[PDB]
Design an enzyme around this catalytic site. Sequence first.
Site, PDB file in Angstrom:
ATOM      1  N   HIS A 116     -39.986  -7.888 -23.543  1.00 55.05           N
ATOM      2  CA  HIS A 116     -38.820  -8.037 -24.408  1.00 55.05           C
ATOM      3  C   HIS A 116     -38.525  -9.489 -24.761  1.00 55.05           C
ATOM      4  O   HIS A 116     -37.523  -9.754 -25.434  1.00 55.05           O
ATOM      5  CB  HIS A 116     -37.588  -7.376 -23.776  1.00 55.05           C
ATOM      6  CG  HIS A 116     -37.057  -8.077 -22.562  1.00 55.05           C
ATOM      7  ND1 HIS A 116     -36.385  -9.280 -22.625  1.00 55.05           N
ATOM      8  CD2 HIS A 116     -37.063  -7.719 -21.256  1.00 55.05           C
ATOM      9  CE1 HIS A 116     -36.021  -9.642 -21.408  1.00 55.05           C
ATOM     10  NE2 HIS A 116     -36.417  -8.712 -20.559  1.00 55.05           N
ATOM     11  N   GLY A 125     -31.170 -14.952 -18.479  1.00 54.71           N
ATOM     12  CA  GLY A 125     -32.377 -15.723 -18.287  1.00 54.71           C
ATOM     13  C   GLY A 125     -33.118 -15.438 -17.000  1.00 54.71           C
ATOM     14  O   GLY A 125     -34.265 -15.883 -16.854  1.00 54.71           O
ATOM     15  N   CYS A 180     -34.502 -12.847 -16.170  1.00 53.12           N
ATOM     16  CA  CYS A 180     -35.644 -11.986 -16.441  1.00 53.12           C
ATOM     17  C   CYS A 180     -36.948 -12.729 -16.189  1.00 53.12           C
ATOM     18  O   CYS A 180     -37.083 -13.914 -16.506  1.00 53.12           O
ATOM     19  CB  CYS A 180     -35.586 -11.486 -17.884  1.00 53.12           C
ATOM     20  SG  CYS A 180     -33.949 -10.896 -18.365  1.00 53.12           S
TER      21      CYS A 180
END
Lengths: 305, 305
Positions: A41, A143, A145
């Site tokens: 993503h 962030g 991720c």
Amino acid sequence: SGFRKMAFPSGKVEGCMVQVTCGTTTLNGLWLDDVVYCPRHVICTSEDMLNPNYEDLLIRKSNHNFLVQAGNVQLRVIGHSMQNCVLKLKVDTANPKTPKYKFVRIQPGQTFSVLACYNGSPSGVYQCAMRPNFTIKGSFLNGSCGSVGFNIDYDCVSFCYMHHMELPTGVHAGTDLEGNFYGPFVDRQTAQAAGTDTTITVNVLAWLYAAVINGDRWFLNRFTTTLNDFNLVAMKYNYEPLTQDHVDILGPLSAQTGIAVLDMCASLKELLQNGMNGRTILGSALLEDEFTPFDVVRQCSGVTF
Amino acid sequence: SGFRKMAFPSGKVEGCMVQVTCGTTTLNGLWLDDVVYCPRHVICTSEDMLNPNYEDLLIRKSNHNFLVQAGNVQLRVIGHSMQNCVLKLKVDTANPKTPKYKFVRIQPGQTFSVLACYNGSPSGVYQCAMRPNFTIKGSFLNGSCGSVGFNIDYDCVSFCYMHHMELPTGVHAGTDLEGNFYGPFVDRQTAQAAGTDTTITVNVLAWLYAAVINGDRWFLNRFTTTLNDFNLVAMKYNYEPLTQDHVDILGPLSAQTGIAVLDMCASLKELLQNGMNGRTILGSALLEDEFTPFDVVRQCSGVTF
Ligand SMILES: CC(C)(C)NC(=O)[C@@H](c1cccnc1)N(C(=O)c1ccco1)c1ccc(C(C)(C)C)cc1
Ligand SMILES: CC(C)(C)NC(=O)[C@@H](c1cccnc1)N(C(=O)c1ccco1)c1ccc(C(C)(C)C)cc1
């Protein structure tokens, strides 16, 4: 003596954390050998995340659209592909700090250490468990991720988690290093909910064996119970059903403490029916379920890495 | 979102952990530049630890009696001295992994990360606080002596603790890196007890501001109180007296949440007088006091290192 919620040394994982930017979105990546792993993503835009078609979106992206940064050194992306919900960016240089590693998909109830990262730089490390509903109760901000959860086996790092999303309730969702989500969650901004979060019973039992090992014995009662009878009370309090394997897994702690497993089940039964009456066990007022039988042995024995 | 008990990345500390043996006693040492720091009681024997005279015992020891091992490489001890309750072994080679570091003596109520080690090898990392009675509620087994507690400031490691003893109650005692014990404890096998362990009130308040930031607001009541009135209830429940500095320290969280400090004090007051009625705050059934106002900001903002 003493029992704290404890994580693996994160040095080996720190050396693999890089930053990945695509367009305006930045997140963390994992750099092993000459491949960087990151959530797919990263290629989405805030508008496209309602219903992302990753196949079409990835078509508009070239190698030079993925910006990878190890420290302040840029890596040359010479290849990109998509495996499930994770991107694989192939770089020209192998990570000199690559440790012996493996990709494993853990089972619900198992634990792991999380190295929370932001912009490819580590910020902190803590211990999590894979809830029975396949979420984790992490500490992740925007962030975060791309941060990974792992276990250590002496010298080999077993990666088992990579963070992707925060669920509406506040829990967190992600995939293994092959890009397969734990649970029924998908990387889109839609209404997703996790099922009932049961209590990992076997882990609670190991926590009680941990307490007995550390001097907290006040909850040891005088009864015993049957595995079926104990289950009738567990599944009313949303506890995981105990199996013979769980009893076998707990054998080591049962032999060390000299307390049969079914007797501790009776102690747990009375704790569930009557509460803790304002007392504490190992400094906690709740029954902790995020310690596996193995974690208890490791911490009460001194296994180094 | 989410709030877990979280520690600093331990990579920088891992590279300084060595093993130290003298006679039959083995423990951990800290290797910075060309000096190894370890507890002086490495020179004691099981019989001499009732009343050790370290001045006389150290006289019978030469350089070649101290066995230091970094990995499987032996270091040549070319000097040894005693500073307070810690030994300083000077070696011939400077630690190539020495990071930017400093020796600080922290204040009661402050926190730090502990890298539990055994035989100079890290085993795990967790977060502690310096209790108001100058003990820590660590997780230390035999041989854990010499492990250090630290804080990280971007790139600089601030060492503040080195483990020495376990107290009869099960708590733990140690010194700073200059060898000065936190508290009134001494490195001998004698009857030692810590005073009353009060609750670090300001830390509890930051934990409540943490909860409000994470969606747990059920405990926010409709009253307010005075700093003096709040103290009259705190010092009955063995809570640390709140000062204006504490109110100032908490300012950032008060401005972020929009809840004046004295209003949260009233919420805490009603929690102390009436309990939590079986509810939870940030997944805990107790009032956590091992998060400083700074730790909350760091975790709810994303400060990386
Ligand atoms: C809850 C939600 C509205 C979806 N916000 C986030 O998920 C935050 C986020 C916030 C806190 C912890 N982890 C992720 N979030 C991020 O913070 C992020 C995205 C990229 C780098 O950081 C995020 C995760 C996934 C998506 C899609 C829908 C594209 C899969 C979009 C944003
Ligand atoms: C409680 C007590 C009986 C004193 N046992 C320990 O302190 C364990 C120990 C056990 C668990 C955690 N930390 C230390 N303990 C040790 O484990 C140890 C000693 C050397 C290497 O490891 C220890 C600490 C200090 C002393 C003297 C009295 C010489 C200062 C002796 C032994």
